Write a protein that binds this ligand. Sequence first.
Ligand SMILES: [Zn+2]
Lengths: 242, 13, 98
Amino acid sequence: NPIRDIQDRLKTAKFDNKDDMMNLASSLYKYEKQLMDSSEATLCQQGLSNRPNSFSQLSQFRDSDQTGKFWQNEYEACKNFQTHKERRETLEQIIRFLQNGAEEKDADDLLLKTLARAYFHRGLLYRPKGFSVPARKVEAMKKAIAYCEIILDKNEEESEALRIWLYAAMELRRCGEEYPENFAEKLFYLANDGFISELYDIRLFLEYTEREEDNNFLDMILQENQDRERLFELCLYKARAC
Amino acid sequence: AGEKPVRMWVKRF
Amino acid sequence: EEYEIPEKARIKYKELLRVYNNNPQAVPESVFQSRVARENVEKLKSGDLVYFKHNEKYVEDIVPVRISRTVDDRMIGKRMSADLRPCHGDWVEDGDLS
RNA sequence: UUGAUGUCACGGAACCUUUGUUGUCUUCGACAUGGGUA
Ligand SMILES: [Zn+2]
């Protein structure tokens, strides 16, 4: 029960504490979201016990009052769904709920990172219905770039925002579109950040090498462990490095 | 209605 | 020696005012009605002469005349079991849900 | 405010998806009033 979760959060909640206030907001956010969906949880017709105390705690919370952390955990649930139908639907809900926060001037970077990453992942799931590349896939990859550029203007070397910007830029190339204007500059900054031992990031460093002829990242690529699931990708990456 | 206080003679027993 | 007026006593007095005004058995002649009923008093203002009941520092009840009405300090919802109240109902506690 | 020996843009349906629904007997008996007396 979402209501039972809220009631438990109210029993042990310190408003100066940040761990409790994050759990209480999570229970409140989850209960509201299940209401908007006409899910079977809406059949819970009970209320909160200890009304005078529940009212005071809820009233203090609203005066004391993160959106980013609740929705970040909702996205991490998407990445574990087996079917593309399951992932495509949940990405639909995340995008529509986080659109309001993106418009706000005082928008948390965690909210913007989650929304840009949700646009990128939804862009990968657009099924073609013709000879042309889907126009929605191009728009999704461009929206993800726009959100990341909001973060990148404040901090030109944000580690995750650069990666999401570079992920969407590569998929624009795969769709026949050219690279964005600052693709050379954004790619240089990730090289300054260091080296990431992830297959989906190694290809970004190979693009850096082909444009800057810098050999520092190549030996790191050739030392990768070969116990990973997508072994064909790593063999191709090492052949490019060799 | 007591807007202006008034002095009066009172007798008690 | 002065005593404090809590928000409870003001609400009881404001309930008392509308009972005087909305009296279906009130005399037709406004001259025979009380000052509260005749002038249609709707709030307690400064300089008003009343009869008050106090305990220790705080006041309890306020009446305009010597013999008047005793307004209950609870809503009638508190005078029945909380289980017998409507499953979805109204707020009878202190403070406003607004 | 064009450029010219080359424009199918009348080459492209703002299209697709969501019950104004839910809950309530046109019902009915005890008062009203503030002092007065000492
Ligand atoms: Zn009921």
